[PDB]
Amino acid sequence: EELKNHVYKKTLQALIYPISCTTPHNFEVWTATTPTYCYECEGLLWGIARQGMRCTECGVKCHEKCQ
Amino acid sequence: EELKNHVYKKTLQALIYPISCTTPHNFEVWTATTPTYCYECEGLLWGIARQGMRCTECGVKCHEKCQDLLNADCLQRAAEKSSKHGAEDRTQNIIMVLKDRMKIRERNKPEIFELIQEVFAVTKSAHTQQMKAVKQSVLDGTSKWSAKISITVVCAQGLQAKDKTGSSDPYVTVQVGKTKKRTKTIYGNLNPVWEENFHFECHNSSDRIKVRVWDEDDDIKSRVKQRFKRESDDFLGQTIIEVRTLSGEMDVWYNLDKRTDKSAVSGAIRLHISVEIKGEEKVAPYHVQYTCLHENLFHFVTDVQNNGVVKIPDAKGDDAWKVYYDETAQEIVD
Fold this sequence. Notes:
Oligomer: part of a larger assembly
Protein name (chain B): Protein unc-13 homolog A
Organism (chain B): Rattus norvegicus
Order of helices and strands of chain A: HEEE
Strand content of chain A: 35-45%
PDB class: exocytosis
Family (chain B): Belongs to the unc-13 family.
Structural class of chain A: alpha+beta
Distance between the termini of chain A: 40 Å
Largest interface: A-B, 19 and 21 residues
Subcellular location (chain B): Cytoplasm; Cell membrane; Presynaptic cell membrane; Presynaptic active zone
């Protein structure tokens, strides 16, 4: 019973938003040529020393380790 | 003489700002995830479809096809990026880096410039004045797109008829910025040849040339029209050209377009267009310029300094075969 109801619920969750709804992040490498803060961690992106990734599609500016 | 003085000048220019002053652009690939405009061409960067390059060091946002057309070094393009992000003052700062580089270069290696003067046998005062010239060729010329433009309206083909003759009396106006000039008139012709040249000044690669063809009406109608419309000479068509499509010298024909309420238009106009962002295109193939430099330097060293004795160089390794001279002279030729 436990697994059956757990799996019922996880199947309902899995398919109500099927993973086939989702879109991928087109990241470019982008230099934070000024001190900038990652849209994940709010951590410092700066110069070549701490480059980020800028998505085009999601636009999103982040660490490499955050992308 | 010609090559020697040309090479003297190009050696002075080559070493006043030695190419060893320059910095490289650390480009990342960067998606313009919103519509963006290239710091070289001002052309559209958009999505994955038209990605750019963002430098880190120069910061600079451009097409991939522009990341190299961003001509100046990573100092200068860090300055130009800073002006296109917001801080224009950085540009004056790196103009002052260009000045300070050349002052330091002069003050620290005056013997380079003196040796070029002695090897090319120039005087110290005249060397100071040609040095004002090559300083100015990198210090007036520190950040310039102050183009003289020289527009020969050459000819047209297939023009619309408008005339008192039943053909046309086509002339042309040319305009760049606010400034406006005209050809004289070819009379009774729809395939006119002018070959008429207009000098202009442009200070912006994003300017346009405007070129407009007019049937010369000198009649009671045109004397009346002059009280109500600026273009009293029944318009035959126009072309409009971006200054960044121009370089060096050009000779091109352009199909014609409408403007005024009086417009009926057909055919094309040939324009020769020179643009004096052009500099020393007069290069002896730089081989020959280097040879002239080298022969003058060699006679100067062996004969002038060493009284015909060959001083064997401040040379390194078997590669003495590549170190022809002492540092100053070696750095000159290198």
